[PDB]
Amino acid sequence: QVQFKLVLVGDGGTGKTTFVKRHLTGEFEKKYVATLGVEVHPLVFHTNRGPIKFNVWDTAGQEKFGGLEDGYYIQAQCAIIMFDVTSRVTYKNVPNWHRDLVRVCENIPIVLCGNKVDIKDRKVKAKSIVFHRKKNLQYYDISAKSNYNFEKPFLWLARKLIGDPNLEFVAMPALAPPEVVMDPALAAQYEHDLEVAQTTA
Ligand SMILES: Nc1nc2c(ncn2[C@@H]2O[C@H](COP(=O)(O)OP(=O)(O)O)[C@@H](O)[C@H]2O)c(=O)[nH]1
Ligand SMILES: [Mg+2]
């Protein structure tokens, strides 16, 4: 099978568990591995070139108590580092998560996601999101509770791993129905503001 270990990391409380859980089959088929303090969710996605399975590793909360063991990171073939757009500290801690990860796994494709963009009161705006630039990471705004941009990180990663820049998803996996509305106007403003921030580089 055409699988990839994906490591999902970032501060406690940023929405990691909530985000992996959108993918309903992935949630139903998860596998808990107590030796490592993890739930591995098999998130299958279907591309114009067939299926790709991301085995997403979700913590059991130990990130609140400290850093993650070598256990968690080894063999990762990709990753998502998450922060909370309503907390500057969580963004401020991004560099530390990236450093812990690349320590074990040097040349991985990584996406950075700013979560909870459904919240009107946004603290970490596009202009302040610079970490990913010099590190060659993709960035996406995300709202786990509304599925907003759910696919984006996975689609960019599938492209890097398969080596097809044109890959697309032919159908979406069944997702948990949006629990909160993502205001369409905020989405439009934010996507552009990222594009405006990128041209100051
Ligand atoms: N509105 C909103 N709240 C969110 C979102 N993602 C997470 N939260 C809230 O953030 C808290 C932490 O979420 P959790 O998924 O357990 O995160 P984790 O500790 O990083 O794995 C809970 O109150 C979530 O419901 C999001 O997309 N929108
Ligand atoms: Mg969690």
Ramachandran category for residue 163: left, alpha or beta (phi over 0 → left; psi -120 to 50 → alpha) = left
Question: Rounded CA gap, 14 and 79, in Å?
Answer: 15
Token readout for 163 is 């080596």
Ligand number, closest to the Cα atom of 144: 1
Ligand number, closest to the Cα atom of 60: 2
Q: Are 70 and 20 in contact (CB under 8 A)?
A: no
Look at residues 137, 123, 132, 126 and name the one whose alpha carbon lies nearest to residue 84.
123
Residue 168: Cβ within 10 Å count: 12
Q: Are 112 and 139 in contact (CB under 8 A)?
A: yes
Ligand 2 centre and the CA of 8: distance in Å? Answer: 9
Ramachandran category for residue 15: left, alpha or beta (phi over 0 → left; psi -120 to 50 → alpha) = left
Ligand 2 centre and the CA of 107: distance in Å? Answer: 25
- Give the pairing of strands 31-33 and 38-47: antiparallel
Q: Is the Cα torsion angle 40, 42, 45, 47 positive or negative in sign?
A: positive
Helix, strand, coil shares, percent, the chain, to 5: 35, 25, 35
Residue written as token pair 């594009």:
195
Q: Whole-angstrom distance between the N-terminal and C-terminal Cα of the chain?
A: 40
Measured from the Cα of 143, ligand 1's closest atom is 27
Q: Are 72 and 39 in contact (CB under 8 A)?
A: no
Question: Rounded CA gap, 189 and 1, in Å?
Answer: 40
Domains, the chain: 1-201 (3.40.50.300)
Ligand 1 centre and the CA of 162: distance in Å? Answer: 30
Resolution in A: 2.5
Measured from the Cα of 146, ligand 1's closest atom is 27
Best residue among 8, 17, 18, 183 to mutate for probing ligand 1, ranked by most atoms within 8 Å of CB: 18
Ligand number, closest to the Cα atom of 85: 1
- The 3-state DSSP class for residue 100 equals helix
Residues with CB under 5 A from ligand 2 (ion): 16-17
Look at residues 122, 120, 177 and name the one whose alpha carbon lies nearest to residue 150.
177
Residue 53: Cβ within 10 Å count: 15
CA dihedral (26, 135, 116, 30) in degrees, to 10, reads 10
Nearest-5° angle of CA 117, CA 166, CA 81? Answer: 35
**Solved how?**
X-ray
Question: Rounded CA gap, 80 and 159, in Å?
Answer: 15
Ligand 2 centre and the CA of 20: distance in Å? Answer: 9
